[PDB]
Amino acid sequence: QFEERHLKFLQQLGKGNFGSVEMCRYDPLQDNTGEVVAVKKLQHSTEEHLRDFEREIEILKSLQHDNIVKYKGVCYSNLKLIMEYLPYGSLRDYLQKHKERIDHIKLLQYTSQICKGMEYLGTKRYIHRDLATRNILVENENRVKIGDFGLTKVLPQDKEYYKVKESPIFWYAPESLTESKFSVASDVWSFGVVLYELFTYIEKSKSPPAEFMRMISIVTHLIELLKNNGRLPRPDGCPDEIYMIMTECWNNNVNQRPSFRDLALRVDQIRDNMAG
Ligand SMILES: C[C@@H]1CCN(C(=O)N2CCCC2)C[C@@H]1N(C)c1ncnc2[nH]ccc12
């Protein structure tokens, strides 16, 4: 496995409320030729949280896909999830830092890959629940991965939704805000928000919090706005078939939101029509 005594702390890669992600070297020969790894652990470790976490490792372990971050293992004395380390970091940071080299055709490459990732998730009846650029990783200039599964649930065998009561409320589907119900359709809502993020280049002045707050007890006010068909605006320069996808994803009716398989096709065609 991984002996935690050969696991060297290099640098803090992020902190997410109830969990941390660290860059570490696993170095059993103590000459720093050991492999650099990403290491996830809990921070205010709770009995319920540990169980959630042991459920999360199983999920990721079960997942094998070019656009899902690779499981490497676990380490125990203090339960730590071990994953491959991807230097380019989260898509959110990466976009802001290299956007001058990221054009619309490139954004649409990342988008398709996210959809394929999500296609594969639904193939296992997995609801991600935390779709946002902060959770997508950048492999190389031509590839992204879904890189965290902290809120991921498995749909009961009978149901098309999973119920669970801080939350990323400016990414949440209406029914998710009022009923705590999540689904592939709620994941499709959030994907639409991810698409928005992508097409605003993560500009602080254009963020879902920024825009909704300008439109706006905060969660209540927000429920009213979405009920009333208040929606994030079309990003500057955003193609009409792209804002179209976003608005379809943001359908109030759960049964009217597109499919990931359809989203992947349409995105791929938009991007191929743009190019040549
Ligand atoms: C983007 C990704 C998910 C979120 N995470 C994080 O901060 N959180 C998830 C749990 C709470 C906080 C950061 C993590 N980053 C930057 C990584 N960077 C490089 N290689 C990596 N391998 C595995 C993750 C990872």
- 204 φ/ψ angles, rounded to the nearest 5 degrees: -50, -45
CA angle centred on 79, ends 76 and 82, rounded to 5°: 85
CA distance 249 to 243: 10
For the CA of 17, the closest atom of ligand 1 is 11
Give 73's strand partners.
Answer: 82
DSSP state, residue 123: T
CATH number of 1-85: 3.30.200.20
Give 219's strand partners.
Answer: none
Q: What would the two tokens of residue 83 be?
A: 């994953």
Do 1-85 and 86-272 fold alike per CATH? no
Name which of 110, 249, 251 is nearest 191 in CA terms: 249
CA distance 198 to 249: 15
CA distance 142 to 244: 25
Kindly give the distance from the C-alpha atom of residue 136 to the centroid of ligand 1, in angstroms, as a whole number: 8
- 9 φ/ψ angles, rounded to the nearest 5 degrees: -70, 120
Does the domain at 86-272 match CATH 1.25.40.10? Answer given as no
Q: Find the residues whose C-beta lies inside 6 A of ligand 1.
A: 13-16, 19, 21, 38, 40, 69, 83-86, 89-90, 135, 137, 147-148, 150
CA distance 145 to 91: 9
Query: By the 8 A CB rule, do 193 and 209 touch?
Result: no
For the CA of 38, the closest atom of ligand 1 is 22
Query: By the 8 A CB rule, do 184 and 122 touch?
Result: yes
Nearest CA to ligand 1 atom 17: 89
* Domain segments of the chain as ranges: 1-85, 86-272
**Among 90, 94, 95, 202, which residue has the most ligand 1 atoms within 8 Å of its CB, making it the best to mutate?**
90
- The reply to whether 199 sits in an annotated binding site is no
> 18-52: buried (b, 16+ CB within 10 Å) or exposed (e) per residue?
ebbbbbbbbeeeeeeebeebbbbebeeeeeeeeeb
